[PDB]
Design a binder for these strands. Structure first.
Ligand SMILES: [Mg+2]
Ligand SMILES: [Mg+2]
Ligand SMILES: [Mg+2]
Ligand SMILES: [Mg+2]
Ligand SMILES: [Mg+2]
Ligand SMILES: [Mg+2]
Ligand SMILES: [Mg+2]
Ligand SMILES: [Mg+2]
Ligand SMILES: [Mg+2]
Ligand SMILES: [Mg+2]
Ligand SMILES: [Mg+2]
Ligand SMILES: [Mg+2]
Ligand SMILES: [Mg+2]
Ligand SMILES: [Mg+2]
Ligand SMILES: [Mg+2]
Ligand SMILES: [Mg+2]
Ligand SMILES: [Mg+2]
Ligand SMILES: [Mg+2]
Ligand SMILES: [Mg+2]
Ligand SMILES: [Mg+2]
Ligand SMILES: [Mg+2]
Ligand SMILES: [Mg+2]
Ligand SMILES: [Mg+2]
Ligand SMILES: [Mg+2]
Ligand SMILES: [Mg+2]
Ligand SMILES: [Mg+2]
Ligand SMILES: [Mg+2]
Ligand SMILES: [Mg+2]
Ligand SMILES: [Mg+2]
Ligand SMILES: [Mg+2]
Lengths: 106, 98, 197, 49, 175, 129
RNA sequence: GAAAUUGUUGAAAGGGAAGGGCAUUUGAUCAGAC
RNA sequence: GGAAUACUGCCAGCUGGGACUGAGGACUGCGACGUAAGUCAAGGAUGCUGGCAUAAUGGUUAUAUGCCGCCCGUCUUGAAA
RNA sequence: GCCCUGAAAAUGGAUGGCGCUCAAGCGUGUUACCUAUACUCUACCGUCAGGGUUGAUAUGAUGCCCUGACGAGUAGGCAGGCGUGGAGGUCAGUGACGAAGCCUAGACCGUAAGGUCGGGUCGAACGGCCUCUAGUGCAGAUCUUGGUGGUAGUAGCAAAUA
RNA sequence: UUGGCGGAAAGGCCUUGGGUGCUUGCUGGCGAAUUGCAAUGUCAUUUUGCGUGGGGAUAAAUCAUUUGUAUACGACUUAGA
C-alpha cells in the first residue's frame, strides 16, 4: 500500500556514562511507544540497525548499516541498553535507529 | 547560536556545505586518476615492490611538473642488473630447451 | 512523532516549559514556540521586575560592549532560560539550539497549523489557586520592549480571520455528522459496531 | 520596526540624479531607469498596482 | 649465520581432541506453531506476506506455501524465529507432505569450485524452474485452495500484505 | 598451511611513546619511565598516557607467532635454510637484509624445492620477472 | 650529507592558543591469506 | 460457630524470555537411567546452514564528534605558581 | 514550628548554573532506579608456595606439567634483561648482482629497553652466537663548543645652515 | 482553465468548467518461483557540469590623471572618454 514498514523507530540518546566518565561500548536507545520496563521487556534481544549514507559507492550501494542488539532495560521509563558490533560514532546522539521484529517469539 | 539572529541555522548549514564540497573534491580526484586502483585490478602493485626508480625506468623505456627524477648512475645500475637477469633466464631456457 | 511540533505558549510557566523543550531538543525533535508574550512566571510583578533589574545591573566594567547582553523581548527571555538549560558551548548543544524557533504572536506560516500544549507546564494545573503570577508581555514592556501594541493589533486581525474559518468548518462538520448518522442502523454499521468501530 | 515595501519613481528623471547613481559618469552608457521608463506606456499598470 | 638455532623444537605431531559430551536432541517449538497456521513473514524477499504453515522439517526449518495462486509464494523453507504465527487456522489434513525433505531443496553448490560466473561470465540465461517443482506446487495448491475457499475474505486476506501503521505498538498487539 | 593454533589476542596494540615526545624534538619517542617528583604520568592521574606493565604480556601459547601462525627464523644461506627441513609447520624462513640478489635466487629455489615458507620473497628480486 | 630552520607543490583543519587519553564515523593508504 | 484471604517462611516443585563466556584436548574419576550390553545434561562446545573471497573484516594515518586532560625538572610539611 | 527584623562597604556575579512557589524549598515515611580501579564469577600475564615426571628414538631435569594464593608506592635494597667502543674463539658468516651510514603518510615480533624485513640514497667494508674488558646509554647542570630562529623587512640610517 | 483572497517573515489558501487516468463499492480469468532458511537489500526530496536545446537581454567597478567640504597611510568627497 502506502506503508511498507516492518520495524519500530527509536532514537540513539547517549553512551553509558556517570557524570564525567562515559563508556562508548554501551548505547542508550529510546524506543518509540514504550513507557515502562515491563513493556520494554518485549524488545529484549531484538536486532537494531543504524542506517546511513555515504558518497563513495562501495559494493553496489551508497547505503551503509551498523548492526547491534538490545541487551537490557535502563531506568524507570522504558529506555533500553544496547551493544553494537562496532560502537556508534557519537555524532549520532539524537539520530534514529530501526528495531526489527526478529528473532521472534510472539 | 549567533545572538544577532537566533532563528537561523548556522553550524548545520556550514557542516552541510562542507561535506558536500569534500565529496566533490574526492570525485574530482578519482576522475583525474590520482588514486590507487582496486586490489584485484590488473595494474595494482599490491603485494609487489613499490619503486619510483623502477617505475620511471620502465615508463621511459616504454616511451606536468613533478619531483621524481631518475639519476643516470642508478639507471646504469638498473641496466646492468637487467642484463644479469636476462643472462640467467637465457641459461634457464637454454637448459630447458636442450 | 510529528516532523515539527508547534507549541502555543499562552498560559505556561517559563522554567517548566524550558526544561521540557530543552530535553526534546537534545533528543532530536524540532520545536516552534509561538505567542511568547503570553507566558507566565510564578510570583509577583514587582518581585520579578526586581529580579530583572538585578540581572540588568551586571556588565563588564571596563567595556560595556563586551559584557552580558540584556535582550528585552519575551522571546529572548524564554531563549535565555532555554540556553541556560542546554550546554551551548559544544557542537551538540549548538545543533540542538538550531533545532528551535521562538516568536511573538503567530506569524505565517504557523497561523494555519495546529498548536499543542504541555500539561506539566500549564499554570492552571501547576499553581495553587490564590497565588500571584506575572505576565511576560507586561514585564518586558516595563523593562524596555517597545512593540506591545503592534503585536496586539496583528493578533486581533488574526483572531478575526480564524473565527471566520472556524464558522465555516463547524457548519461542514455538522452536515458531515448528519450524513454519517443516517447511514447507521445499517448491516455494515452493525458489523462494524460488533467489531468495535 | 518599520519596513519599506514599495518604491515608485517618476517617468522623467534628470541628469543630476543619474549622476548620483553613477560613480564613473564620463564613461557610462547612461542606461539607468531606461527599462523603468517603459512602465508608463499606455496601460503599464505596474505603477498603478 | 644470521641467527643461532633453537636448542629445542616443538613437535609437529597433531593431537586429537578429547571426548566431547554434547548430544543432539530435537527442537522444542513454540506452542503457537501447529500446521495449518497462517504466518507473517518478517524477513527475506517475501517480507510481509501471509503464508500457510504445512510441515516441520528435520533441519529445524518450516515448510511453507503461499499458496502460489493466491499471493505468489511457492513451496519454501523458512526459519522459525523469522516469522510471526497468527491465530487463523486452515485444515491441512487433506494434503500429502510426505515427499518434501532436505534433499528436495538440495542445491548444486558447485559455484565454490571456481565459478566462472563468479561475478558473471554471461549475466544472463534466466534460470529455469523444474517441472517436478511446478507439479508439486499445483497439487498442493489444489488441495489447499479447496479448503481456504470456506471462510469469507480469507483469500483477500492472504493476498494482502502486512505493514505497521502509525501508532501501532507491537508489544500491545494481538495477532 | 601451518599448525592449528588458537586465536591470537593482543592486549595493547598502540605504541608506548614517551611523555612530551610531541612538544620537543630533543625528546625521542623511545619509552622512558617518568621519574619526577611531581609527574602526573608517574602518579597516574586520569587523562594521561599509560605505562608498560607485566599484566599486558601475551599468552604463552601464541607468543612470537606471526598472523600466518609461524615463527620467524633468519637465514643467510642454504645451510641455514636446511636447518629448518623437518619443521616446516612451525617455522618460516626469512632472507637477511644484506644477502645479494645472486644468492637470493639460490636460497628461494632451494626453499621451494624443500617446502619452507619464505616471509620475504620478491625482495631485491624485481627485474627478474 | 642528520637536526634545528626555510622555499615550492599536493592533502587537511581553523568563531579568543596548540598538543594528549578512551571509543567510533569519514577520507586516504596497506600486509597476510585462502 | 464454621471458614477464607492477607503477612512471614520453606520446597532436594514445574516453566517462559534476555545477556556474557566456551579455558582444556587419546583413555583413566564420581555418578545417573536400565534386569544388562549400553545410553547420558556425569573431571570446561558441539551440530547444521549461508554469504564473501577482497580492501569486505582488520591495521596504519589525517581529521571530526562525546567525555576527560594545568609545564617539565628541583628543594619543601606544602608547586599550575 | 516556619516566615520578617535581629546592621550592612565599596569593578559585575554566583544554592555550581539555569531556574523553581499544593516546589525543583523544609520535616518525615515507603518503594523503584543510576553508577567506583570496591565485591562475586571467568579468561590471560607475572610472582610466591606446595608437588608430579628415568625413558632415550624427540628435544631445552636450567625442561615439561599439576594445584592454591597474591599484585598501590617516594627515599632505598636486590634480581632478570636491552644497547655501545675494543679483545680471544667459532659460523671454511655477509659483501661491487652493492658493506657501513642516512631518509621512509610501507610490513612484522617483544609488557618494555629494542629487534627484524621492504623501498630510496650511497660506494667499501661489516655481522650472529660463546666468552673478556671499559674513557659504555642525557632533556635539564644561569652546562661546554658549533649552528639556527621568532622579534622583523621592524627600531633605525635626524649634531656640524646647501 | 474561471475567478477571488492573503504583506507580521504575504510566497500560500479557496474556487469555476471541460479533458483524461485509476477506483478495493461488488463478481470473475491469468501472472509471480532460483534473492535458494536472514543480511538497509537501495524506491521521496537537489543543484549543476561537458556542449548540444528555445526565445530574449548588450553593463559597470577599480588603478592611473584631478579636487579639497577630507586626510599619518588607507579611507572620504569631486571632475574628465
Ligand atoms: Mg607492538
Ligand atoms: Mg610530592
Ligand atoms: Mg628539516
Ligand atoms: Mg577448547
Ligand atoms: Mg580501511
Ligand atoms: Mg572499518
Ligand atoms: Mg580509518
Ligand atoms: Mg578538564
Ligand atoms: Mg613542579
Ligand atoms: Mg537537583
Ligand atoms: Mg522533602
Ligand atoms: Mg536493578
Ligand atoms: Mg590488589
Ligand atoms: Mg609493585
Ligand atoms: Mg626508587
Ligand atoms: Mg674506548
Ligand atoms: Mg663491537
Ligand atoms: Mg663471499
Ligand atoms: Mg646499502
Ligand atoms: Mg615521519
Ligand atoms: Mg644486536
Ligand atoms: Mg666475530
Ligand atoms: Mg663518560
Ligand atoms: Mg650524547
Ligand atoms: Mg642535549
Ligand atoms: Mg634529568
Ligand atoms: Mg652557544
Ligand atoms: Mg622604518
Ligand atoms: Mg636619531
Ligand atoms: Mg647635519
Amino acid at each position: 500500500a502506502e506503508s511498507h514498514r516492518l520495524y519500530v523507530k527509536g532514537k540513539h540518546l547517549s553512551y553509558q556514562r556517570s557524570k564525567r566518565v562515559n563508556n562508548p561500548n554501551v548505547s542508550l536507545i529510546k524506543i518509540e511507544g514504550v513507557a515502562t520496563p515491563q513493556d520494554a521487556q518485549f524488545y529484549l534481544g531484538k536486532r537494531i540497525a543504524y542506517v546511513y549514507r555515504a558518497s563513495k559507492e562501495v559494493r553496489g550501494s551508497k547505503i551503509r548499516v551498523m548492526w547491534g542488539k538490545v541487551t537490557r532495560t535502563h531506568g524507570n521509563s522504558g529506555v533500553v541498553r544496547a551493544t553494537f558490533r562496532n560502537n556508534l560514532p557519537a555524532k549520532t546522539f539524537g539520530a534514529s535507529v530501526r528495531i526489527f521484529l526478529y528473532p521472534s517469539n510472539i | 547560536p549567533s545572538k544577532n539572529s537566533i532563528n537561523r541555522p548556522k553550524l548545520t548549514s556550514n557542516l552541510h556545505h562542507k561535506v558536500h564540497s569534500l565529496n566533490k573534491k574526492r570525485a574530482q580526484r578519482e576522475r583525474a586518476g590520482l588514486l590507487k586502483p582496486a586490489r584485484s585490478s590488473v595494474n595494482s602493485k599490491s603485494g609487489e615492490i613499490k619503486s619510483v626508480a623502477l617505475d620511471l625506468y620502465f615508463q621511459n623505456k616504454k616511451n606536468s611538473i613533478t619531483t621524481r627524477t631518475l639519476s643516470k648512475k642508478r639507471a646504469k645500475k638498473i641496466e646492468r642488473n637487467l642484463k644479469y637477469a636476462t643472462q640467467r633466464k637465457l641459461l634457464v631456457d637454454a637448459s630447458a630447451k636442450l | 512523532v510529528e516532523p515539527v511540533v508547534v507549541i502555543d505558549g499562552k498560559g505556561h510557566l517559563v522554567g517548566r516549559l524550558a526544561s521540557v523543550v530543552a530535553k526534546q531538543l537534545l533528543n532530536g525533535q524540532k520545536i516552534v514556540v509561538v505567542r511568547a508574550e503570553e507566558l507566565n512566571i510564578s510570583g509577583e510583578f514587582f518581585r520579578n521586575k526586581l529580579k530583572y533589574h538585578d540581572f540588568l545591573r551586571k556588565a563588564t566594567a571596563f567595556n560595556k560592549t563586551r559584557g552580558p547582553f540584556h535582550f528585552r523581548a519575551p522571546s529572548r527571555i524564554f531563549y535565555k532560560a532555554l540556553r541556560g538549560m542546554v550546554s551551548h558551548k559544544t557542537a551538540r548543544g549548538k545543533a540542538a539550539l538550531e533545532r528551535l524557533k521562538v516568536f511573538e504572536g503567530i506569524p505565517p506560516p504557523y497561523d494555519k497549523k495546529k498548536r499543542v500544549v504541555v500539561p506539566q507546564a500549564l499554570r492552571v494545573l501547576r499553581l495553587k489557586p490564590g497565588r500571584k503570577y506575572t505576565t511576560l508581555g507586561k514585564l518586558s514592556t516595563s523593562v524596555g520592549w517597545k512593540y506591545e501594541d503592534v503585536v496586539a493589533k496583528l493578533e486581533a486581525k488574526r483572531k478575526v480571520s480564524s473565527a471566520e474559518y472556524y464558522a465555516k468548518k463547524r457548519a461542514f462538520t455538522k452536515k458531515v455528522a448528519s450524513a454519517n448518522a443516517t447511514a447507521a442502523e445499517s448491516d455494515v454499521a452493525k458489523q462494524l459496531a460488533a467489531l468495535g468501530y | 520596526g518599520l519596513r519599506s515595501l514599495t518604491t515608485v519613481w517618476a517617468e522623467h528623471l534628470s541628469d543630476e540624479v543619474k549622476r548620483r547613481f553613477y560613480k564613473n559618469w564620463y564613461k557610462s552608457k547612461k542606461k539607468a531607469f531606461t527599462k523603468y521608463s517603459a512602465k508608463y506606456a499606455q496601460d503599464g499598470a505596474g505603477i498603478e498596482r | 649465520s644470521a641467527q643461532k638455532a633453537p636448542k629445542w623444537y616443538p613437535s609437529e605431531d597433531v593431537a586429537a581432541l578429547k571426548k566431547t559430551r554434547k548430544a543432539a536432541r530435537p527442537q522444542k517449538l513454540r506452542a503457537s506453531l501447529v500446521p495449518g497456521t497462517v504466518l507473517i513473514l518478517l524477513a527475506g524477499r517475501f517480507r510481509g506476506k501471509r503464508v500457510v504453515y504445512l510441515k516441520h522439517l528435520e533441519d529445524n526449518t518450516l515448510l511453507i506455501s503461499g499458496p502460489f495462486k493466491v499471493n505468489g509464494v511457492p513451496l519454501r523453507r523458512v526459519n522459525a524465529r523469522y516469522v510471526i504465527a497468527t491465530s487463523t487456522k486452515v485444515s491441512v489434513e487433506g494434503v500429502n507432505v510426505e515427499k518434501f525433505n532436505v534433499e528436495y531443496f538440495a542445491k548444486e553448490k558447485l559455484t565454490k569450485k571456481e565459478k566462472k560466473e563468479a561475478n558473471l561470465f554471461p549475466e544472463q540465461q534466466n534460470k529455469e524452474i523444474k517441472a517436478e517443482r511446478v507439479e508439486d506446487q499445483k497439487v498442493v495448491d489444489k488441495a489447499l485452495i479447496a479448503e481456504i475457499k470456506k471462510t469469507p475474505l480469507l483469500k483477500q486476506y492472504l493476498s494482502a500484505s502486512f505493514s505497521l501503521k502509525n501508532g501501532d505498538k507491537p508489544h500491545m498487539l494481538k495477532f | 598451511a601451518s599448525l592449528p593454533h588458537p586465536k591470537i589476542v593482543k592486549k595493547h596494540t598502540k605504541k608506548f611513546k614517551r611523555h612530551h615526545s610531541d612538544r620537543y624534538h630533543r625528546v625521542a619517542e623511545n619509552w622512558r619511565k617518568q621519574k619526577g617528583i611531581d609527574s602526573v604520568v608517574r602518579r597516574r592521574f586520569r587523562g594521561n598516557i599509560s605505562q608498560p606493565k607485566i599484566g599486558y604480556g601475551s599468552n604463552k601459547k601464541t607468543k612470537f607467532l606471526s598472523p600466518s601462525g609461524h615463527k620467524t627464523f633468519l637465514v643467510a644461506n642454504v645451510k641455514d635454510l636446511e636447518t629448518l627441513t623437518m619443521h616446516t609447520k612451525t617455522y618460516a624462513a626469512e632472507i637477511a637484509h644484506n644477502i645479494s640478489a645472486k644468492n637470493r635466487v639460490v636460497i628461494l629455489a632451494r626453499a621451494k624445492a624443500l617446502g619452507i615458507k619464505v616471509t620475504n620473497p620478491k625482495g631485491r628480486l624485481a627485474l627478474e620477472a
